[PDB]
Design a protein around this ligand. Sequence first.
Ligand SMILES: Cc1cc2nc3c(=O)[nH]c(=O)nc-3n(C[C@H](O)[C@H](O)[C@H](O)COP(=O)(O)OP(=O)(O)OC[C@H]3O[C@@H](n4cnc5c(N)ncnc54)[C@H](O)[C@@H]3O)c2cc1C
Ligand SMILES: Cc1cc2nc3c(=O)[nH]c(=O)nc-3n(C[C@H](O)[C@H](O)[C@H](O)COP(=O)(O)OP(=O)(O)OC[C@H]3O[C@@H](n4cnc5c(N)ncnc54)[C@H](O)[C@@H]3O)c2cc1C
Ligand SMILES: *SC[C@H](NC(=O)CC[C@H](N)C(=O)O)C(=O)NCC(=O)NCCCNCCCCNC(=O)CNC(=O)[C@H](CS)NC(=O)CC[C@H](N)C(=O)O
Ligand SMILES: *SC[C@H](NC(=O)CC[C@H](N)C(=O)O)C(=O)NCC(=O)NCCCNCCCCNC(=O)CNC(=O)[C@H](CS)NC(=O)CC[C@H](N)C(=O)O
Lengths: 461, 461
Amino acid sequence: VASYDYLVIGGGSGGLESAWRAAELGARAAVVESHKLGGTCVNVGCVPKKVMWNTAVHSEFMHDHADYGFPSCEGKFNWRVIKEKRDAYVSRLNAIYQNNLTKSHIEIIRGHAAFTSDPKPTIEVSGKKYTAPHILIATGGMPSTPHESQIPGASLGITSDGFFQLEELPGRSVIVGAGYIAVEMAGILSALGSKTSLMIRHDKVLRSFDSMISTNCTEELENAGVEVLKFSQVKEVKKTLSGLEVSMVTAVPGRLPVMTMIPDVDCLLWAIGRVPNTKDLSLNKLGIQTDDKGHIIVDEFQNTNVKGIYAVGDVCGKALLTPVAIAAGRKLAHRLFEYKEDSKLDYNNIPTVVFSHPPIGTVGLTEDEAIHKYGIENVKTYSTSFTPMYHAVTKRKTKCVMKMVCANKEEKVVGIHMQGLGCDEMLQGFAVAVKMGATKADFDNTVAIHPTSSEELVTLR
Amino acid sequence: VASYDYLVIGGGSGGLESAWRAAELGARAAVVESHKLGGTCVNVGCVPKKVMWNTAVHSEFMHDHADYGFPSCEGKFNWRVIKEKRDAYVSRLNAIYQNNLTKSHIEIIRGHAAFTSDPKPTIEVSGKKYTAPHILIATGGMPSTPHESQIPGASLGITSDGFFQLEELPGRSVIVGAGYIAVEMAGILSALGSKTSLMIRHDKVLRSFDSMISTNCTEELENAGVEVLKFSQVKEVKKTLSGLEVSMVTAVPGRLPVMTMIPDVDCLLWAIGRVPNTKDLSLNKLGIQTDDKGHIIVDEFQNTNVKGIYAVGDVCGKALLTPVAIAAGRKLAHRLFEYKEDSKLDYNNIPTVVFSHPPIGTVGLTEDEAIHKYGIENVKTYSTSFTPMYHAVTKRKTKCVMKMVCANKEEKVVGIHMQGLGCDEMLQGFAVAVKMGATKADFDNTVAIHPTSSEELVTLR
Ligand SMILES: Cc1cc2nc3c(=O)[nH]c(=O)nc-3n(C[C@H](O)[C@H](O)[C@H](O)COP(=O)(O)OP(=O)(O)OC[C@H]3O[C@@H](n4cnc5c(N)ncnc54)[C@H](O)[C@@H]3O)c2cc1C
Ligand SMILES: Cc1cc2nc3c(=O)[nH]c(=O)nc-3n(C[C@H](O)[C@H](O)[C@H](O)COP(=O)(O)OP(=O)(O)OC[C@H]3O[C@@H](n4cnc5c(N)ncnc54)[C@H](O)[C@@H]3O)c2cc1C
Ligand SMILES: *SC[C@H](NC(=O)CC[C@H](N)C(=O)O)C(=O)NCC(=O)NCCCNCCCCNC(=O)CNC(=O)[C@H](CS)NC(=O)CC[C@H](N)C(=O)O
Ligand SMILES: *SC[C@H](NC(=O)CC[C@H](N)C(=O)O)C(=O)NCC(=O)NCCCNCCCCNC(=O)CNC(=O)[C@H](CS)NC(=O)CC[C@H](N)C(=O)O
């Protein structure tokens, strides 16, 4: 049994970041990775995604090339190519990580970890036992795909992972999901050719965001050429000689249900879930407490119910983004190794950007969460709806919607929601501001940048 | 003599904005405009500019279309077209302004104003006299072009105005200036075809910005294909049968001066100055005090040395941007009409974005202004130099440089400087933060957006 000071299971974002801060404060640390380091962020998430998004933003422009006074192209985008190059980047990234870890002097034990009986907190890896007072579990989370029980033909669908394995742009895409990975997937395929359809249980996507966002984004997906199939779900999937035949039910409120066939489908995407990676961790042997869905349960300091065992990132099932993994992983290293009793991540005002077309940007709480936490009389909302100056000379148009949720007398900006061009790099500055309890005044006292979209967020009337 | 409560001379940004706030607080106001309302911002500045910049950003992409997996185009951009459309937009904008003013019920007296003898503050317009206790002078500023005395062939050069009148992209461009309108002009023409050259007195442009910016921007102009001609100035210009022949002197420090001919020049741009519009205002009749360069002199409340006479915008010669015109014009309306003794514009931390390729973004003071106001021991600078993920798959590359100037113990962020993709909509959030005395910690406590460039500004180490 090799004893350490820190043992971090999983080598993805949350975790790499912790072990790293731990080595920094002086600590005998190891990270147990089952396969590719960099986790999801590098391999099949953030990075591969943004590359494709970036590729998509190029079709949107190729469509406006004529309006801006240049001739045009024709079409035929070769997916094969961009695919290859995106992979060589993931490779470069992995090698950087390989080197970075080995240089910061961290024992990268490689293999599959699990908990044993061993009285005090101890893990095995490929028949070897390692232990250390503090073991952090950062085992991530995987894509949820339906069971053949419920949906016969379930296994025929592909997920984000498989999406990042596509060697050719699928001429006909079908996406099931109304969240962000769904919205994101639907947009890339549509922009890049595939006649796509987004099948959602209700009438709008991103039902978890502000009304304006969930609304404006369903609409934009529509004008973009996506096909929102509302109050629908796949009954069964059947591999024809053509491709796939999706039988889905459209049960619109107030109407009579109708069962439909969706033929010659190239790709059927399960963009419905991220189940935690907890099963074969064999937590059971320590009584490590969990969710009724496998997620590990921790307190406001990332402590499991067991002493010396913690959790961070996707696995815990809260704020499923890379930076929350990092911010939670590194903050821990300081509580422990710097002996800082106040280091914990404040899960409020966490900013999230969704890369649809156009980009969704948002931080803080929504009108409703607000109205509830304050009072219908206490919540004031300012908003704007304009057209980016980018479409003063284009036929192809998209909007930009900005909303500000203020609280109480002083008009404390407690929620900023927006969709529009540049909304990806637009948010962050305001996140810092918002994080530092900015009032509508501070916003209003800031001199504008003209001409910009951002200027609109500070001139709200 | 028609008496009012407010009389605003000039109908541009500063001014329209004031008169407007004045009408809002209940006031008999008028605005005396000599020609096109909207001033410079609409007609020959901000707006016409951003349209062209936007057009330029399209060539930069057309050059990367192949890398992103699509075929290509060929070249031949028709300037004629984009030109036309940009004008119809200025027209739409003017009409909006025409209507807006007439609806907010403001007497738009049209013609050329001037001050008379008349004991108490009084102006004439086309042989008509108007007066009112408060008269604001927002007469703007014009482009400075050399005198035939100094430079024989001076009048042969065109300025920003004329640039916005070009009906065809000039195959050979020559630009004299090392400031932002110069840098901006040089970039658009180069991206859009014209074999351009930027003749500057020294070795770098934007000598007024942070070292990093002034440096990185000279370099980027170079890799972009511009031609920085250092320690050079035009001796004389001569209209040949071909086009123009620029004779310029290259007096590099440590070398021997050399006089050179620059043949077949299509366009020679005077991007050197903005002299105030004060001459025929006939201030003289009131003793309205000024600069040794015509600029009006005011105090920290926009008061001239005469009671009941104020000044705002370009004319005053400070912070020559649209928003400073607005922020100064509207703040005045409240001091006066709302009777607010504290309404004045804090000219510190004013944010400015320069639209070069890539975009320059910056707010607060530089390392040097800082080091001086604090102490070489008291100023700490954090910085990053990375490549936007946009060029993970491109051959064509550009960087991104971010610098943070902190002050004292608490590491107060007192200056943010950057150049890079999306740096146009990136700045503003931080401007609010910076405006509210943000410390490096607040920056550091903000959860990141991944993947973004903005995330880099909050993870500075
Ligand atoms: C498409 C797509 C787009 C996304 N886009 C974004 C985005 O734009 N922005 C964003 O901020 N987030 C995004 N995410 C989510 C985000 O990347 C996750 O929150 C983030 O990956 C951090 O995860 P984590 O640290 O919990 O570890 P994970 O990334 O899940 O990685 C854990 C690592 O642990 C290893 N492992 C598992 N169990 C064990 C065990 N028994 N022992 C040893 N090794 C084991 C795994 O092999 C893996 O490499 C996206 C996800 C997908 C899929
Ligand atoms: C290229 C170019 C790009 C620019 N880009 C930007 C930018 O991106 N961002 C930015 O924020 N700023 C920019 N500016 C500068 C900015 O637009 C000025 O600060 C801004 O125009 C505000 O000016 P002002 O309010 O003092 O009035 P001005 O815009 O100069 O307008 C004054 C109006 O007054 C009228 N007038 C003059 N004298 C009299 C008198 N005797 N009586 C009656 N009428 C009279 C004029 O006809 C004019 O229409 C740019 C300028 C140029 C040229
Ligand atoms: S996808 C892995 C992810 N990376 C980030 O979040 C980058 C942000 C920040 N620079 C950071 O903290 O790394 C992540 O989960 N990283 C966490 C981790 O545990 N970090 C350990 C310490 C690593 N710090 C070393 C800094 C330089 C290392 N660089 C690389 O590993 C290569 N690139 C990156 O990791 C990221 C994503 S691949 N780089 C970029 O995104 C490019 C720059 C910019 N943010 C952009 O989006 O263009
Ligand atoms: S170029 C004139 C300039 N306009 C602005 O600075 C716009 C910012 C802000 N919305 C504003 O205060 O107008 C300016 O000098 N304006 C000052 C003026 O004196 N204002 C009087 C009151 C006008 N407020 C009415 C709001 C709606 C009016 N809209 C128009 O006049 C048309 N468009 C605009 O004025 C601007 C520039 S043409 N619109 C945009 O830039 C588009 C939106 C976004 N900012 C973008 O850049 O895409």
